[PDB]
Structures are given as C-alpha cells and as structure tokens.
RNA sequence: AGGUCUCGUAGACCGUGCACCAUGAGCACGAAUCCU
RNA sequence: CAGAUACCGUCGUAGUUCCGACCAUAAACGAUGCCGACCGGCGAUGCGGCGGCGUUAUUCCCAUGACCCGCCGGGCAGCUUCCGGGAAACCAAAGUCUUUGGGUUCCGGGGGGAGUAUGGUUGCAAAGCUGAAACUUAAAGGAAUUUGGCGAAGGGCACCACC
C-alpha cells in the first residue's frame, strides 16, 4: 500500500497554505519549489511531499478543502456572505395568515391591518404519523 | 445479578402462560419467551422462476408463496445464528434490524 | 533534549530490581540513534553486589 | 520561578486588586490556579501525609503498582482542604496531592454552645456528610472539651481550627479515604445550612469581573 | 453572627438565592449573578444603573430559572405586569 | 422590558414576524413552555405569543447591554441555520463568535489555546447545542438561549420563544437583537430607521446561491 | 454436589434409619 | 423498632426476648449445655495427672510439631 | 388508612419545602394544625396562610418562604415532664441557639420556651428548626 | 402520423444440526519521602 | 466410548385423560408484605364517562357502531432525568433516613454441623409443620474494574498455519 503519513501531509498542507501562488500542476516544477522553499533532509520525503502538493493542487482546482486556509479560495466566501439584494422577501404586498393568529393579533395591539389576508382552516385534523 | 429489566420474556401481570415446542429442538418453552420468526418465502427461488414460467400453461401466472411460523428455544435460536449477544448499553434497543433487503 | 537513567541491581533487598526514569524525548530505532544519543555503561562495586548504570 | 497567570482571576489577584479570598468565596468563583491560595495563605498553611495507599492493575506481565497520596491542608484559624492524587512514584503523587489539596480548600464557620462570649470554638449546629457507606456527624461541645474522634477526623478538625466537637461515625471506617472525604464533606456543609443568625436581606455587591474589567482589558487581551 | 459584646465573628456573609432563599455555597459553580440594565424613562438609553439577581445552582439545574427571572423582573417593574 | 411607551413593538416588526414565520412553532410542547403559547389549532402547530417574545427579547437585550465589555459576550451557533447570523451579530455588537464545531474544553480546560472565559453567553438552540450548556455549568456564567416550543429548558436563564428551525426567523431574531442592543447602547437612534436590509443575517442553501448567481448579473 | 441430590441421599438415609428403628423395636 | 403504639410494650419485650434468645453468645451463655460440656466446669484453672506425651502436628501453612501432654 | 393528620400535613409541608414550591395545599385541617401553623408563623418560619372553608373538612393553603429546614411529628404523643424536656432538647434539636419543640400543655399549644416560662409540661407534638 | 413510454437496476437473505474429545505433583512473592 | 447400567435411535410398564377420596409441596420469583399521604416530564395502551372540526354505515335530521383531536378515574406497562436513595448493579420507588417516630403482621444475627438428633403432631404411604446441641472453622459471601483463558460471537493477519 501507498498511504502518506502525517508528516508528509502536514508539510504539504503548510506548503499549500503558505506558498500558493508559485505552484502548479507539474510535479517537477513544484518539486523544485519545495526543494528551495523548505529544508527536507532526504529525497524520497521530498518526492512524496511534492506528489501530495500536486494532488492537493488538483483538489484545490475543483473546490475548497477543510484543512487549507489560503487567500484565493476565500474572499469569494466573503463576497458571498456580504452580497445584499434589492427585494426584501419580508416586505410583501400580501401575507396569508391563520384565523386564530388573526384573533391573537386582534387582542395584542391592533384592530385591522391593510396587509393580511385570512385562509380557511383545514377540515381534517390528522397530523401524526401512524405509529401505535 | 439481575441482567434485564424484564425476565427475558413478555410477562408482566400474568404469572403463567401456555408453553410451546421448539422447531429446531423439542424443548417446552413458554410462548412469550421463545424467539418467534414469521418467514415468508416463494416456492421457487430467483433462478428457477424463469424455468417455471417458461414451462407454464397459463401466461402471466402468479407464483404462490409459502407461509410458516417458527418457534425457537433460546439455545436453538442463538446456535442457528438468529440472534446473538450484544453490548450492555446496546441491549435496551427494541427496534429490529432494518429491512433494507 | 531528554534523557533516561536506568539503575539495575539488588536495590534494598535480596531480590534485584530496576528503576527507570524516562522524561523528555528519546529515539530508539534507525540510523539517527547513532549520532543523537550517547550511551555509557558503568558498574558500581558496593558491599552487597554489583550495580549497573545505563545513561543515555 | 515566576508567575504567568493564564486566568484573568489569577492576573487580577497578582495585580493586587483583590484584597483576600473572602470575596472569591462570596461570589463562588472556581479557583483553578493553586498558587492564588498560596499567595493569600503563605507560611501559615501546614500539611502532612495521611496515608499512602498502593493500588495495582493486572496486565499480561504482572501487576503495575501505583501510589495514591492523601494530604490535609489548611490554616489553624479557618480554611481547610483535602486532595487525592495517584501516580507511578511516591513523591510525585505526594506533590500532586499537595497541589490538588491547596487547589480546593473550603471555609468553615464556628459557633457557640449556649452563651455567646469570647471567640467561637465549636461547630455551630449538627452537620452530616456522607460518601460511600461512611457517615460522619459533627455535634457541638462545651468549651474545653476537645475533639472526641478517630485520629484522622481529629487532625482534620484541629487543622480546621475547631477546638471542640462531638462525633459519631457509622460504616466501614477502616477505609481512610472514604472516612476523610466523609468528614471533609461534613465540615464543608457548615455554610450550606441556614441559621436564623442570617435572615436579613443581602445586598449583591459588584463582581470583580465587572468592577475591574477596564483594568483587565488593558492588562490582557 | 454576633456575641455578647456586639462585634461580628463570621468572616463573610454568603449570598442567598433571590428565587428560593437558599444560601449559595462557596463551591457551587452553577450559581449565577445576572445584572439587568435600567433604562432612561424618556429617551430609552442605558444610563448606568443595574438590577441584580442571584440564582442558585439547584434552581438553574432544575430548569425553572427563566420564570424566576421573569417573576423578579415583574416584581421589580422591568417586565410589564400585563405580559 | 417593554414597560415604557417608547419600548413598544411597532408596525413593521409585526409584519416581519408574519413574513418570517415566527409566530408558529413545532408539534410537541415542552411543559416549561406553557405560558409562552397562545393556543393550539388544526394540523398540530402551536402559536407563539409575539408580545411575550418581545418582552423576552427586551429582557435579553437589557442583560446584554448591562455589561460594559462587548468582547465578554460569547455567541455560539453550531447548526448551519445560524452560521452567518451570529457572525453579523458579533460584527455589529462586538461579541465573540463561535460558528460550528464547539470543542469540548474551551470554558474549562485552562491550558488550551482556545481557553475562553467570558461573562455572558448567547446560544441559538438549547437542544442541538447541549455541549455549551453543560460546559457553562462549571463556571459562574449565565446563558441566554433562543428556545422553541419543544426545546428543553435546562441551565437557561432568559428563554426567548421563537421558531429556531427556519433560517428567516433565526436571522430576524439576530438582526433585531443587534438592533435593540445598539439602540440601548446609544449608537443607533430610536426613531430614524437604521434598517439596512434584514437578509444579511439569513442563511440559504448553496443551490439557491448558484440560482441567484445565474439569475443575477 | 448440588442440593437436590444431597437431599435425595438424605431422604434415603431417613428411610434406612426409620426402617432400622422400626424393625429394632 | 416496628411497634410504635403508646400501649405496645408487652409485644416489644417479647420480641426482644425472642430475638435475644435467637443469638450466639447469649445462647452459649444462658443454657446449661455449653457449661456442662466444658471440662473445667466454669473454672479458670484445673488439676490432673499426666498420663502420656503426644507430639501433635501443626497446620498446613507451617511445618513443625507441637509437644503436648494429656491430662 | 389516614390516622395522623398532623404528621401528613408536616410531611407534605417538608416535601414541598425541599422541592422549592411557594404554596402548599393541606387537604385535611384540624385545630391542632391551626395552632401549629400559628406557632410557626409567630416564630417566623412560614408565611401567611389560609383556611379553605367547605362544609366537610377545610383545606389550608400556606404561603411558603425559604426559612424552613425540616418539620417533623413525634408519634405517639409521649407525655413529657419539665425535668424530661432537656433530654428531648439534646436528642432532637440540631443546636441550642435555635430550634423549637411544640408540645401540648394544658395552657395551650406552645413551644418549649413558653412551657418553661409558664412552668408546665404536657404531651409531645413535633419539632421544627 | 410516430413503432423498444420516461429515469439507474442487490436481480446474493438454499436450508438444518455437525464423530471421539479425560487428567495435571507442589515448594519459587519483597508494598516506601524529602533537600541545602 | 478405554469403560457408558449416560447424550443418540427402536420398542415399552406405571403415569399422562375423567370421576370419587388423600398430601400441602415449587426459582409457589416482582427473589421486593398490607393500608394511607406527598414529591418531575412525555408518548401510547384496556375499561367507563365527558366535550369538540371533519369521514363512513352512500347523499336530510337525531341517536348508536367505526375513525380523529383532547379531558377525567382505576389498572398492566414503557422512555428520559444531578428530585432523592444505595456498596454498586439499579429503583419515580428500593424516594420523602443522624434533619433518624404515619399504623400494623411475619422474619434474620459469621461460615459448617443442619433443616440434623430427639419429642409432639398430621397422613394409608411417600412425607409436611415445629426444631437443637456437642464439635469444627477465619473466613464464607454481594456489587463492580483490570488481565487471562472459552469445544462463545463479530472483523482481519502469518508458508516458523493451511490449500
């Protein structure tokens, strides 16, 4: 079997996190990059780290990874969490409401609002799944 | 020590139940204690159903099924791989194994 | 970086025993055990017998 | 050898903003640095080992023995504590028990037997503590009686500052750990009991975390 | 708490739970002390006053503490009486 | 909490309640929730009283603004319904957020890197977040929770009755909580609408994200 | 030995001693 | 106790007497059989003539014999 | 069956005191229960209570406060003299600074201090502290 | 008028007990704190 | 099978069935006496009663049956719980117990001898009830953890294992 240990995976993960722009999909190019940006005592460890960096690059090219915190794969998350629409989806010209909710709003503070319309209650009072 | 909340059976306010006989065995086991298994099967398996259907007078004929109820004693049921032992915290699970297939 | 001391002998009794004091970091296998740890074995001549020293 | 507090309570005590552990006990805050109490109570905090009890675990290659240490801590005019720690060696277990005992000490209160003259000397009421099968009762005594107990609750009551007590024990008292924890839980219950000496409406003073938050936000992040 | 001469011999006076009138112990870490802010009567802004309540750990672990805080706020006048 | 005339629930807030589906709850009823229920109806849906929800929201806002260090309020949401809402709440009021995977040992283990020791705690669900509730017991630390009609009440202090299942209602509670805290603190005027949009606190499935990206520019 | 067969052997000893006593009258 | 009535003293005394007789040390200390089987006859010391000497052996933990006489 | 109404009443009061309730519903009342509750009122352990008057046997609703530790009833009514009260003081009370013994004297239902003041003794009822 | 209705095909729960299978000589074990 | 007056297989007497007369014995176990009061929640279930939208015994009405949503009382039970208890397993009672007293019946004082001797009593008999002592012994037991070994179960491995 060929399963990478935790040292190779941690080294490749911090290499992907910390030096991301000067990388690529070629094994020899990021092999030389990992040769110069870090100190690896042996050569088999260098080749295994470079191979996992290539695999992680191919994985990043398809989507995000929950071990990696680079700059480029975020801030579209930030723009996605900060885009603001026009239509509120709560400021509606008509809103359906239940009759007991209408009577509850009658008692609370109001007599009549020009936004609500009332729907009929259900004629069947079945709501529970048959379990027994 | 006491192993179960019940006593390995389903008797709560009775004191006596009628006994039944095992099917793999001949032990006189009480009716609510014995592990019961209602199994339904076809007369033919999935391999011979095509051979029965190709040699049938009636086209689009429904194959009958076989209905039998099995009564097992405790040692007979655990030795025939019907029920096995489980963990102390998992012994209180009441739901059967899932009917995925 | 870390050390261990092993003293084996008839430590307070007729039957011998051994006490091991391990804390820190100590590698055991491979080529880097040759040039990272330093092993010395010594013998102590007391009035009751021989006591050994293993330090690394 | 220096103090680097990891909690804001320890930093606040080190910054001389908390006068004593009175308000710490009043606000019922947990103490997680054992040297806060060592700062508040210094040379007046004596200790001695109650019993070293060996425990063993059976493995494939014999028994792995371990030593468990019991130590009593406390000043002779107030607070008292108890700590249990087990390790491979004896000295490591004893020092860990010392740290764990000094980490968790409780205040005791003293009352009178009849008239309220002089300083308080005895247990104010009848308190009981139980753990395992052991029951320990503390009964008030007149002045000059002394402690009528087994030696381990006697030394715990002398290190707690109580001069007079009547006791009555029930259960397997041969186990020293359960007996010591039982009398510790008995003597710790002297403040959970409601007496008519304090029925007036208390006022809730401000917590140190509210009072010194401007100091805390500057001294630490 | 006192003697014949008149001074106090208890080293501290412990708190009592405002919902159950039980003494909060020194090692009872489940007990809380919540401060509730008082508001200005005209503008509606926090001025600097507090309303304090202490609940013991037994009431909090029983699950009947939120109605205790609601009742204390009703009796203090924080939560309106009609509710 | 709502006893004054300036602290009344206005016209638009009732419309936000009726459009976000706050007033209706789950099927089962917890016995601690008998007083925060108006009545029951057909198909097994309990009606949450909106005025008592307003009173509890004002009480929780008072408890939040009562302390003077805004970083000492810790807000935890571990379910996907309130991930971005508690982040926008912490960005608005200055609180400290936890969004998913609350590690068991922040409030108790003193040697961890994530050792947090706050003064007030806000959580969005008492049932799914059972881990901060029991961890809040070992220190003297109150807890404010957004509670449903079937959520169990244990180790909670201010229970705001709401529908914590839909993302719209949860975002609406976090937005009005930030609004009321900023109004009590004095940053936001009480009569001018500071309302930016309520949808900045709303969670949505990613399928709607590519749907909106395809339908928009 | 279980108590059942020790009780059976005890009852057999009762029968033997009773027979010997009643025949040694 | 079990009987807690105001007029329950004969029953308590009879039950305590029965449970006192149903004991061990009170049972040997109040019949005449345990003192009659005693060769001293309720005495601290006794005299007699030695007939012979016997070497009685020890139990299974230890290996020795005990020098003894018969009186 | 129901044989000691006062023991049942103090048992329900003690159970609801340990539970933490603020109001206790005693179903059967008696004059002895009224005097016991009046003594517990006058010594400041319980609050302001009621008598729910129906035409069979009244009910009593007691407003509770958190000052009560235990309420017990000694059964049966042992006769106690003035020289035998101190024995009960040491083996029934938790302390000498507080705690009271309710006993039935010929001058009325009262505590042990008023019994020593009026120089009389009677039968035991119970205790509270 | 079109002439293979639409979307992928766990579609193994063949089954039952299972030859004879006994015994083990004992000597060989000691429970712990702190620095000048 | 070394032996097999045992497990296994073929026969097979009393017995197994009913009537009439006997004994009063079970792990007759919820291994947990009876009456009464109090202390959390939830979903179902059997009976009786009460209330309410709807469907059906074919289209209208009423009552009865059958479904649905709830309440009340008694009963067999279930899930969860820092109520509380306990040596723990566990118990909503085995809780309300050194903060010890609601009323009442039976019964146990280390392990063997021993349910044995003797006496009385019941029965046709087998046997049932009552029930010792001498002597001997430093342990016998209850709950739970770790290892270990199962002709116990579930996953994998090894040419010092096999095919």
CSV table of N, CA and C in Angstrom, one decimal, chain A residues 66 77-92 95-98 100-101 103-105 107-110 112-116 121-128, chain F residues 8-12 14-16 18-20 23-24 27 38-45 47-51 84 87-88 168 172 195-200 202 204 208-209 212:
chain,number,residue,atom,x,y,z
A,66,UNK,N,-11.1,21.6,3.7
A,66,UNK,CA,-11.2,21.9,5.1
A,66,UNK,C,-10.0,21.6,5.9
A,77,UNK,N,-16.0,33.6,-0.6
A,77,UNK,CA,-16.9,33.3,0.5
A,77,UNK,C,-17.3,34.6,1.3
A,78,UNK,N,-16.4,35.6,1.3
A,78,UNK,CA,-16.7,36.8,2.0
A,78,UNK,C,-17.7,37.7,1.2
A,79,UNK,N,-17.4,37.7,-0.2
A,79,UNK,CA,-18.4,38.4,-1.1
A,79,UNK,C,-19.7,37.6,-1.1
A,80,UNK,N,-19.7,36.3,-0.9
A,80,UNK,CA,-21.0,35.5,-0.9
A,80,UNK,C,-21.7,35.7,0.4
A,81,UNK,N,-21.0,36.0,1.5
A,81,UNK,CA,-21.6,36.3,2.8
A,81,UNK,C,-22.0,37.8,2.9
A,82,UNK,N,-21.5,38.7,2.0
A,82,UNK,CA,-21.9,40.1,2.1
A,82,UNK,C,-22.6,40.6,0.9
A,83,UNK,N,-23.2,39.8,0.0
A,83,UNK,CA,-23.9,40.4,-1.1
A,83,UNK,C,-25.3,40.7,-0.7
A,84,UNK,N,-25.8,41.9,-1.0
A,84,UNK,CA,-27.1,42.4,-0.4
A,84,UNK,C,-28.1,42.6,-1.6
A,85,UNK,N,-29.3,42.0,-1.5
A,85,UNK,CA,-30.2,42.1,-2.6
A,85,UNK,C,-31.0,43.4,-2.6
A,86,UNK,N,-32.0,43.4,-3.5
A,86,UNK,CA,-33.0,44.5,-3.6
A,86,UNK,C,-34.3,44.2,-2.9
A,87,UNK,N,-34.9,43.1,-3.3
A,87,UNK,CA,-36.3,42.7,-2.8
A,87,UNK,C,-36.1,42.0,-1.4
A,88,UNK,N,-36.9,42.5,-0.4
A,88,UNK,CA,-36.6,42.1,1.0
A,88,UNK,C,-37.1,40.7,1.3
A,89,UNK,N,-38.0,40.1,0.6
A,89,UNK,CA,-38.7,38.8,0.8
A,89,UNK,C,-39.5,38.8,2.1
A,90,UNK,N,-39.5,39.9,2.8
A,90,UNK,CA,-40.4,40.1,4.0
A,90,UNK,C,-41.3,41.3,3.9
A,91,UNK,N,-41.0,42.2,3.0
A,91,UNK,CA,-41.9,43.3,2.7
A,91,UNK,C,-42.8,42.9,1.6
A,92,UNK,N,-43.9,42.2,1.9
A,92,UNK,CA,-44.8,41.6,0.9
A,92,UNK,C,-46.0,42.5,0.8
A,95,UNK,N,-49.9,39.0,2.7
A,95,UNK,CA,-49.4,38.0,3.6
A,95,UNK,C,-50.6,37.1,4.0
A,96,UNK,N,-50.5,35.8,3.8
A,96,UNK,CA,-51.5,34.9,4.3
A,96,UNK,C,-51.3,34.7,5.8
A,97,UNK,N,-52.4,34.4,6.5
A,97,UNK,CA,-52.4,34.3,7.9
A,97,UNK,C,-53.6,33.4,8.3
A,98,UNK,N,-53.5,32.7,9.5
A,98,UNK,CA,-54.5,31.8,10.1
A,98,UNK,C,-55.5,32.6,10.9
A,100,UNK,N,-56.9,32.0,13.9
A,100,UNK,CA,-56.6,32.2,15.3
A,100,UNK,C,-55.4,33.2,15.5
A,101,UNK,N,-54.5,33.2,14.5
A,101,UNK,CA,-53.5,34.2,14.6
A,101,UNK,C,-54.0,35.6,14.3
A,103,UNK,N,-57.1,36.5,15.3
A,103,UNK,CA,-57.7,36.8,16.6
A,103,UNK,C,-56.7,37.2,17.7
A,104,UNK,N,-55.5,36.5,17.6
A,104,UNK,CA,-54.4,36.8,18.5
A,104,UNK,C,-53.9,38.2,18.3
A,105,UNK,N,-53.7,38.6,17.0
A,105,UNK,CA,-53.3,40.0,16.6
A,105,UNK,C,-54.4,41.0,16.9
A,107,UNK,N,-56.3,40.8,19.7
A,107,UNK,CA,-56.2,41.0,21.1
A,107,UNK,C,-54.9,41.8,21.5
A,108,UNK,N,-53.8,41.6,20.7
A,108,UNK,CA,-52.5,42.1,21.1
A,108,UNK,C,-52.4,43.6,21.1
A,109,UNK,N,-52.5,44.2,19.9
A,109,UNK,CA,-52.5,45.7,19.9
A,109,UNK,C,-53.3,46.3,18.7
A,110,UNK,N,-53.9,45.5,17.8
A,110,UNK,CA,-54.4,46.1,16.6
A,110,UNK,C,-55.8,45.6,16.4
A,112,UNK,N,-57.2,46.1,12.8
A,112,UNK,CA,-57.1,45.8,11.4
A,112,UNK,C,-55.9,46.3,10.7
A,113,UNK,N,-55.2,45.5,10.0
A,113,UNK,CA,-54.1,46.0,9.1
A,113,UNK,C,-54.4,45.7,7.7
A,114,UNK,N,-53.9,46.6,6.8
A,114,UNK,CA,-54.2,46.5,5.4
A,114,UNK,C,-53.0,45.8,4.7
A,115,UNK,N,-52.6,44.6,5.2
A,115,UNK,CA,-51.6,43.8,4.6
A,115,UNK,C,-52.0,42.3,4.6
A,116,UNK,N,-52.8,41.9,5.6
A,116,UNK,CA,-53.1,40.5,5.9
A,116,UNK,C,-54.3,40.0,5.1
A,121,UNK,N,-59.2,27.4,7.7
A,121,UNK,CA,-58.6,26.3,8.5
A,121,UNK,C,-58.9,24.9,7.8
A,122,UNK,N,-58.0,24.0,8.1
A,122,UNK,CA,-58.1,22.6,7.5
A,122,UNK,C,-59.3,21.9,8.1
A,123,UNK,N,-60.0,21.2,7.2
A,123,UNK,CA,-61.2,20.5,7.6
A,123,UNK,C,-60.8,19.1,8.2
A,124,UNK,N,-59.6,18.6,8.0
A,124,UNK,CA,-59.1,17.4,8.6
A,124,UNK,C,-58.1,17.7,9.7
A,125,UNK,N,-58.3,17.0,10.8
A,125,UNK,CA,-57.5,17.2,12.0
A,125,UNK,C,-56.5,16.0,12.2
A,126,UNK,N,-56.0,15.5,11.1
A,126,UNK,CA,-55.0,14.5,11.1
A,126,UNK,C,-53.6,15.1,10.8
A,127,UNK,N,-52.7,14.8,11.8
A,127,UNK,CA,-51.3,15.4,11.6
A,127,UNK,C,-50.2,14.4,12.1
A,128,UNK,N,-50.5,13.3,12.8
A,128,UNK,CA,-49.5,12.5,13.3
A,128,UNK,C,-49.3,11.2,12.4
F,8,UNK,N,-42.3,49.8,22.8
F,8,UNK,CA,-43.3,49.0,22.2
F,8,UNK,C,-43.0,48.5,20.8
F,9,UNK,N,-43.6,47.4,20.5
F,9,UNK,CA,-43.3,46.7,19.2
F,9,UNK,C,-44.1,47.4,18.1
F,10,UNK,N,-43.4,47.9,17.1
F,10,UNK,CA,-44.0,48.8,16.2
F,10,UNK,C,-44.7,48.1,15.0
F,11,UNK,N,-45.1,48.9,14.0
F,11,UNK,CA,-45.9,48.3,12.9
F,11,UNK,C,-45.1,47.4,12.0
F,12,UNK,N,-43.9,47.7,11.7
F,12,UNK,CA,-43.1,46.9,10.8
F,12,UNK,C,-42.6,45.6,11.4
F,14,UNK,N,-44.3,43.5,13.4
F,14,UNK,CA,-45.3,42.5,13.3
F,14,UNK,C,-45.4,42.0,11.9
F,15,UNK,N,-45.1,42.8,10.9
F,15,UNK,CA,-45.1,42.4,9.5
F,15,UNK,C,-43.9,41.5,9.3
F,16,UNK,N,-42.7,41.8,9.9
F,16,UNK,CA,-41.6,40.9,9.8
F,16,UNK,C,-41.8,39.6,10.5
F,18,UNK,N,-44.8,38.1,10.8
F,18,UNK,CA,-45.8,37.3,9.9
F,18,UNK,C,-45.1,36.9,8.6
F,19,UNK,N,-44.1,37.6,8.1
F,19,UNK,CA,-43.5,37.2,6.9
F,19,UNK,C,-42.3,36.2,7.1
F,20,UNK,N,-41.7,36.2,8.3
F,20,UNK,CA,-40.7,35.3,8.6
F,20,UNK,C,-41.1,34.0,9.2
F,23,UNK,N,-44.4,33.3,14.4
F,23,UNK,CA,-45.5,33.1,15.3
F,23,UNK,C,-45.9,31.6,15.4
F,24,UNK,N,-45.5,30.8,14.5
F,24,UNK,CA,-45.9,29.4,14.6
F,24,UNK,C,-44.7,28.5,15.0
F,27,UNK,N,-44.5,20.8,16.8
F,27,UNK,CA,-45.7,20.0,17.1
F,27,UNK,C,-45.7,19.6,18.6
F,38,UNK,N,-50.1,30.8,22.9
F,38,UNK,CA,-51.4,31.4,22.9
F,38,UNK,C,-52.5,30.3,22.9
F,39,UNK,N,-52.5,29.4,21.9
F,39,UNK,CA,-53.4,28.3,21.8
F,39,UNK,C,-52.9,27.3,20.7
F,40,UNK,N,-53.6,26.2,20.6
F,40,UNK,CA,-53.3,25.2,19.5
F,40,UNK,C,-54.4,25.3,18.5
F,41,UNK,N,-54.2,24.7,17.3
F,41,UNK,CA,-55.1,24.8,16.2
F,41,UNK,C,-55.1,23.4,15.5
F,42,UNK,N,-55.6,23.4,14.3
F,42,UNK,CA,-55.5,22.2,13.4
F,42,UNK,C,-54.1,22.0,13.0
F,43,UNK,N,-53.8,20.8,12.4
F,43,UNK,CA,-52.6,20.1,12.0
F,43,UNK,C,-51.4,20.2,12.9
F,44,UNK,N,-51.7,20.3,14.2
F,44,UNK,CA,-50.7,20.2,15.3
F,44,UNK,C,-49.6,21.3,15.3
F,45,UNK,N,-49.9,22.5,15.2
F,45,UNK,CA,-49.0,23.7,15.2
F,45,UNK,C,-49.4,24.6,16.3
F,47,UNK,N,-49.1,28.1,18.5
F,47,UNK,CA,-48.9,29.5,18.2
F,47,UNK,C,-48.2,30.2,19.3
F,48,UNK,N,-47.0,30.8,19.0
F,48,UNK,CA,-46.2,31.5,19.9
F,48,UNK,C,-46.7,32.9,20.1
F,49,UNK,N,-46.9,33.4,21.3
F,49,UNK,CA,-47.4,34.7,21.5
F,49,UNK,C,-46.2,35.7,21.2
F,50,UNK,N,-46.5,36.7,20.4
F,50,UNK,CA,-45.5,37.6,19.9
F,50,UNK,C,-45.1,38.6,20.9
F,51,UNK,N,-46.1,39.0,21.8
F,51,UNK,CA,-45.8,40.1,22.8
F,51,UNK,C,-44.9,39.6,23.9
F,84,UNK,N,-23.8,32.4,9.6
F,84,UNK,CA,-23.5,33.8,9.3
F,84,UNK,C,-24.3,34.8,10.1
F,87,UNK,N,-22.2,35.7,13.1
F,87,UNK,CA,-21.1,36.4,12.6
F,87,UNK,C,-21.4,37.9,12.4
F,88,UNK,N,-22.6,38.1,11.8
F,88,UNK,CA,-23.0,39.5,11.6
F,88,UNK,C,-23.4,40.2,12.9
F,168,UNK,N,-35.1,32.2,8.2
F,168,UNK,CA,-35.6,33.5,8.2
F,168,UNK,C,-35.9,34.1,9.6
F,172,UNK,N,-33.9,37.0,11.6
F,172,UNK,CA,-34.7,38.1,12.1
F,172,UNK,C,-34.4,38.3,13.6
F,195,UNK,N,-32.4,50.5,9.6
F,195,UNK,CA,-32.6,49.3,8.8
F,195,UNK,C,-31.8,49.3,7.5
F,196,UNK,N,-30.8,48.4,7.4
F,196,UNK,CA,-30.0,48.3,6.2
F,196,UNK,C,-30.7,47.4,5.2
F,197,UNK,N,-30.9,46.1,5.5
F,197,UNK,CA,-31.6,45.0,5.0
F,197,UNK,C,-31.6,43.9,6.0
F,198,UNK,N,-32.7,43.2,6.2
F,198,UNK,CA,-32.6,42.0,7.2
F,198,UNK,C,-32.0,40.8,6.6
F,199,UNK,N,-31.8,40.7,5.3
F,199,UNK,CA,-31.4,39.5,4.6
F,199,UNK,C,-29.9,39.2,4.8
F,200,UNK,N,-29.1,40.2,5.4
F,200,UNK,CA,-27.7,40.0,5.6
F,200,UNK,C,-27.5,38.9,6.7
F,202,UNK,N,-29.5,36.1,6.9
F,202,UNK,CA,-30.3,35.0,6.5
F,202,UNK,C,-29.4,33.9,5.9
F,204,UNK,N,-29.0,30.4,3.6
F,204,UNK,CA,-29.6,29.8,2.5
F,204,UNK,C,-28.8,28.6,2.0
F,208,UNK,N,-29.5,27.6,-4.0
F,208,UNK,CA,-30.0,28.9,-4.2
F,208,UNK,C,-28.9,30.0,-4.5
F,209,UNK,N,-27.7,29.7,-4.0
F,209,UNK,CA,-26.6,30.6,-4.3
F,209,UNK,C,-26.2,30.5,-5.8
F,212,UNK,N,-29.2,32.2,-7.7
F,212,UNK,CA,-29.2,33.7,-7.7
F,212,UNK,C,-28.0,34.2,-8.5
